[PDB]
Amino acid sequence: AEMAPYMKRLSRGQTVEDLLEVLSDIDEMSRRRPEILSFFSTNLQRLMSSAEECCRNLAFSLALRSMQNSPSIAAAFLPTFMYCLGSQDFEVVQTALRNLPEYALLCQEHAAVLLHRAFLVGMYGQMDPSAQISEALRILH
Amino acid sequence: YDIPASASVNIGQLEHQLILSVDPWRIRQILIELHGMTSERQFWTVSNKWEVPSVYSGVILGIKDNLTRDLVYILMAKGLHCS
Amino acid sequence: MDIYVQCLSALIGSCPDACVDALLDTSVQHSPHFDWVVAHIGSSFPGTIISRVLSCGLKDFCVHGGAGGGAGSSGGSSSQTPSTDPFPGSPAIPAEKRVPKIASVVGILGHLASRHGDSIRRELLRMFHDSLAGGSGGRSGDPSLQATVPFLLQLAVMSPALLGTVSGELVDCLKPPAVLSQLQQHLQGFPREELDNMLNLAVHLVSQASGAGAYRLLQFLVDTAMPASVITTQGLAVPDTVREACDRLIQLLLLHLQKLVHHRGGSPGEGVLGPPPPPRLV
Known part of the structure; x- marks a missing residue:
């Protein structure tokens, strides 16, 4: 009941103003009592592929913190992370590689396909992801 | 199941038909039968997904007769959702 | 001596x-x-019949708990019976705060048996005061949520053995399920495996239309329950009705009617709210 109006705002959101303001509110009230992010999974999936850079960064950070609370849900955000890694917006892929090693540790069962797609996106598409994937490799052992 | 022979079950049948119906004349049939069998129950608070704008919700709850309130409210909500 | 101790408490x-x-020492x-x-x-009874209705205490409550533990150190089955009888006789204010404060496993079993007998x-x-006392006893048992699944299983097994008082015991169990938020849901679903359905059908054959209304109310209440494993209950309801896995055709018809009523009750829970309230959790 305490989370219904915020998520009603998140679901019925059109402008960048409303989404950014609700994301700021939920980040502020998720700094303490961080177990409330389990309800914000599907909407965080949908907003993680949004084109605006600030709201996308907030959604990515919230998703990583939601992994940090309970890593058993990392198998559920995999299709969205794979879509962000292989989309045609050229900013979702860079924000995906910026958050690539943390999610690579936090998944640990499907890291092979993730890093495989990272190599093909950075290989066929002209960009350099080598540092991030190699750092994920060194801290993955 | 045919011949329900129960008041609450028939309430449920006419409600599920009312939610699913899009043809306004059929909806009128459901509303008139539903107000005929019931006594003093308002049948607009029967589907929370129906939404009416705030100023229009303020003016639309001012009709005196119950049948007209329920009918015009749910038809205009269904029209807005169909749009 | 006892009167002065009660006055000091x-x-x-x-x-x-x-x-x-x-x-107190x-x-x-x-x-x-x-x-x-x-x-x-008897000393604990004087300290809780009227000494616990004014205000909550700490040293007096500790003295009453020590007296109750000293009484419950031995067997005292007749002592436990008179302690349960005087507590139900004087159910004023914090009667349950003193009855359930023993926190002993054998004491919890005896209190659960006494509460089941009082509910029966x-x-x-069919008295209003007796029903209120039974509801208070069920609420007291709910706060002491240590182990009540075996007690509920024994009560259900005893209910299925009889046919005359089986309807009243079933109605009392259905009411406590509406009161205690259905604590033993999955165990109850697992219990009616193969033979309990026929026994329940035989018991309900001696019931009346009030039994049918009570069954509909119990199905509606258990619809908003079973948060742990509701898939097992849903599959058990589905296979007992349309798959004809039950031992009686009347039992299959009753299960089909229960499924239809559960769908109808679920429709009003999800649809009929009106405007933007807080949503109803099911």
Whole structure:
């Protein structure tokens, strides 16, 4: 009941103003009592592929913190992370590689396909992801 | 199941038909039968997904007769959702 | 001696003072000297019949708990029966705060048996005060959520054995399920495996249309329950009705009617709210 109006705002959101303001509110009230992010999974999936850079960064950070609370849900955000890694917006892929090693540790069962797609996106598409994937490799052992 | 022979079950049948119906004349049939069998129950608070704008919700709850309130409210909500 | 101890306990409970701590220690020392369960039960009864209705206490509550533990150190089955009878007789204010404060496993089993007997007597007599006492006992058992699944299983097995009082016991169990938020849901679903359905059908054959209404209400209440494993309950309901896995055709028809009523009740829970309230959790 305490989370219904915020998520009603998140679901019925059109402008960048409303989404950014609700994301700021939920980040502020998720700094303490961080177990409330389990309800914000599907909407965080949908907003993680949004084109605006600030709201996308907030959604990515919230998703990583939601992994940090309970890593058993990392198998559920995999299709969205794979879509962000292989989309045609050229900013979702860079924000995906910026958050690539943390999610690579936090998944640990499907890291092979993730890093495989990272190599093909950075290989066929002209960009350099080598540092991030190699750092994920060194801290993955 | 045919011949329900129960008041609450028939309430449920006419409600599920009312939610699913899009043809306004059929909806009128459901509303008139539903107000005929019931006594003093308002049948607009029967589907929370129906939404009416705030100023229009303020003016639309001012009709005196119950049948007209329920009918015009749910038809205009269904029209807005169909749009 | 006992009257002065009760007065000191009541004064300590009302006014938070330490003037009755030495008296409580002397009473606790005298109780182990006498080693009488009935005397300690009577001492706990005077300290909770009217001394617990004014205000909550700490030292007096500790003295009452020590007296109850001294009474319950031995067997005291007749002492436990008179302790349960005087507590239900004087169910004023914090009666459940003193009845369930023992926190003993054998004491919890005895209290659960007494509460089940009181609920059976309330259902048989159909008295409003007896029903309120049974509801209070169920609420007291709910706060002491240590182990009540075996007690519920024993009550259900005893109910299925009879046919005359089976309907009243079933109605009393359905009401406590509406009160206690259906604590033993999955175990109840697992219990009616193969033979309990026929016994329940035989019991309901001796019931009436009020039994049918009570069954509809129980199905509607259990619809908003079973949060742990509702898939098992849904599959058990589905296979017992349309798959004809039940041992009786009337049982299959009743299960189909229960499924239809559950769908109808679920439709009003999800749809009929009106405007933007807080949503209803199911």
